[PDB]
Each structure stands twice: as structure tokens, then as C-alpha cells.
Amino acid sequence: MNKHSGIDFKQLNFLTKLNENHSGELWKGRWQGNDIVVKVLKVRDWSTRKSRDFNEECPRLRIFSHPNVLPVLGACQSPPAPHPTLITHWMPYGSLYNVLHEGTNFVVDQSQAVKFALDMARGMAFLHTLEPLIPRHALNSRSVMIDEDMTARISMADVKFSFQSPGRMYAPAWVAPEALQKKPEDTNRRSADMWSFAVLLWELVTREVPFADLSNMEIGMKVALEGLRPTIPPGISPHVSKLMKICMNEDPAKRPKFDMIVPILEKMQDK
């Protein structure tokens, strides 16, 4: 018999639909006393092979051992569920993107922003110790969630499954130039993640969406082929300027590791 049955789809209480797009639907719900979010995945040409792969790839995402990583609580196997489905806890503030750019009630201060940066760096350092790496679509402000005590957490629900279309990139502004152009097996994926963190630093400094005026296709082609880069923000400390520049080094090999920037960010805390 199988090692895991996964979560029983019949035990999910679907409360309210949150959104729908190309990749599927997000719902707020309840399961075994937990407030959850459910992703119902939309997959063209679903097959036994893809279902087998989904079920092999989901257990890796159930990471309960680090405060700055948000696990997949579990997944519904399809069959017998109607559709392949992922479950996480509901994070009350939503994504870092929501908190920074759609924050109608208060503006997070820069002490909180530095704490977000440290949280994300700690979670990424931990994920980078895993062997092999867990494939993700990308680190960006939509794949980081903000929990009830404002802890930032890297969402494992951003997993990239072996069947999902590598040809469509929806947040290229956070992607390293080499990763816009080369297959992942031909890049250092850890160094590519550091570029993404550099763009997150830029986002925390400017409180702007990177390249907001451009479409995703414009961003990817201009960053890859025309050298488009975020402009270094004026009026910031030389220390923050220097950190942003080293994390955004054009040479992937010269970018620091996450475990090197954690102590730098620790020192930038108020405590």
C-alpha cells in the first residue's frame, strides 16, 4: 500500500473563494480545526504519470522545522480527489506583496522591513541546506507570506512540480538574468535565489513594485537582452546600498550565500 494517502478531500470545508487564474483556484477553508487556504490546481492533460509525480513531490514540501518556512500541510491526491490540491495554513496578512503594496490600513516601518529581510534570509539559508534543493517557481514578494505575528515565511506552496510549464514566467522582475536565459540545470540555483533577495531588498527600500510600468514580457526581454536593472535608490545608507549591490552582483559566483547575509542583517536589527 502507499506510504501516504494525503489529505482526504472530503474533509475539506470550503468557505469562500479567494481568486482564480491560469493555475487554478484559491479558497479559504477549514480542515481538522485549522484555518487553511486551498489551492485547487488546474493542469492541462492531467495523466497518471503527472499524478504519480505530484504525489512524489508533495511530501518534500511538508517542512515543519523552521519558523521562516511555511509548509504545505498536505495535499489531496487526484484520483481520488477531483483535482490535485495543496493546503497551507491561512496567513492573516497574506503575502509580503500584499503587505507592502496593498496595505490600506498601515505602512510597515523600516524596522519591520529589516526584520522581514532577516526572516526571509534565515528561511532561504535553511532551504539551501536541503539536498537536493526543492524546486520552486521563484522567490519573490508573492511567494513570501506574513503570519499573525508579522513573521515572514517562505511558502513551500510555490513548489515547481516536474509537470508544470517552465515556458511561462509570471514574476520575471525578481528572476536573475542568467535564469531568464539558461535552463535551471545550467545555473547555480542558490545564487539565482540571491538575486531574487536583492530585488526584495530593493522592494523593501522603495516600497515600489519593481518595473511596475512594464509587462512581464517586456521585463524579461529587457533584463535578459538589454541590461535593464533596478535603479539604486537615493538617500539610503551606504551600508544598505552596499548590501543591495553585492546581492545583485552580475556574476552569480560573487553573490553572497544566504548564511553570509544573515549575520549582516542581524546587526541591522534594532535588537
Partner: protein
């Protein structure tokens, strides 16, 4: 249906072609690309791939297709990949074979472009 617009109204065929030319430039000009000729400028598959990302809001990683195809076979692969992107976005499997586009069949080309126009004419 579309076949009456092609053969037996050649000034409406010219109006459909002028319509499609305006539409594809609305998007491809954002990459500093200009289309003047529907007979050949989509045959190698590159502009169809770039167009799909402009219309459906994604970047296509350059390792996923041949940005500068160097053979008939790579052009066919680009057009096949673009057809997959179209189906990803909801369109039915396109009628022409990918080779029909690479071989500059004007009818095969305008059918594909017209279906993109039917769907995405209001994308900004």
C-alpha cells in the same frame, strides 16, 4: 466562415489583414519589434511566442524556445511550442500543422492570428 473572408472578398481579406497587422504591432512594438508583412514574419515561430506572452502576461524564458532558429526543424518546434502556449491560455488546438506556418501558408497564418485577435483584441 473565415474561409469566405479569405477567398471571396479580397478587399475584406485585405481589411482583415490590415486589422491583424495593427493588432500584432500594438503588442510587439513594446519589444521594439515591427511587423509589416504577415506572409513571412510569423513563419519562424519567434513572434508568435513573444506575442503570446505579451497577450497573456508572462515572459517566456529564452531556453524554452529558439529565439534565433537555425533550421526548419527549430522553426517547427517554435510554432508547436507557440501552439501549446495558445492552448495553455484556453484556445482550442489550432487547425494548421506547425509546418504550415513555417512554410508561409497565408491562410494557415491568418487563421491563427485571427483567433488570437478574436480573443485578445481588448488587451492593453
Amino acid at each position: 466562415a473565415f474561409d469566405t473572408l479569405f477567398d471571396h472578398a479580397p478587399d475584406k481579406l485585405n481589411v482583415v489583414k490590415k486589422t491583424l497587422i495593427t493588432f500584432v504591432n500594438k503588442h510587439l512594438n513594446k519589444l521594439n519589434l515591427e511587423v509589416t508583412e504577415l506572409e513571412t514574419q510569423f513563419a519562424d515561430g519567434v513572434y508568435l511566442v513573444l506575442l503570446m506572452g505579451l497577450l497573456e502576461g508572462y515572459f517566456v524564458p529564452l531556453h524554452s524556445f529558439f529565439l534565433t532558429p537555425d533550421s526548419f526543424e527549430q522553426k517547427v518546434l517554435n510554432v508547436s511550442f507557440a501552439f501549446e502556449l495558445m492552448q495553455d491560455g484556453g484556445l482550442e488546438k489550432p487547425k494548421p500543422r506547425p509546418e504550415d506556418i513555417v512554410n508561409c501558408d497565408l491562410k494557415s497564418t491568418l487563421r491563427v492570428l485571427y483567433n488570437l485577435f478574436t480573443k485578445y483584441r481588448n488587451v492593453e
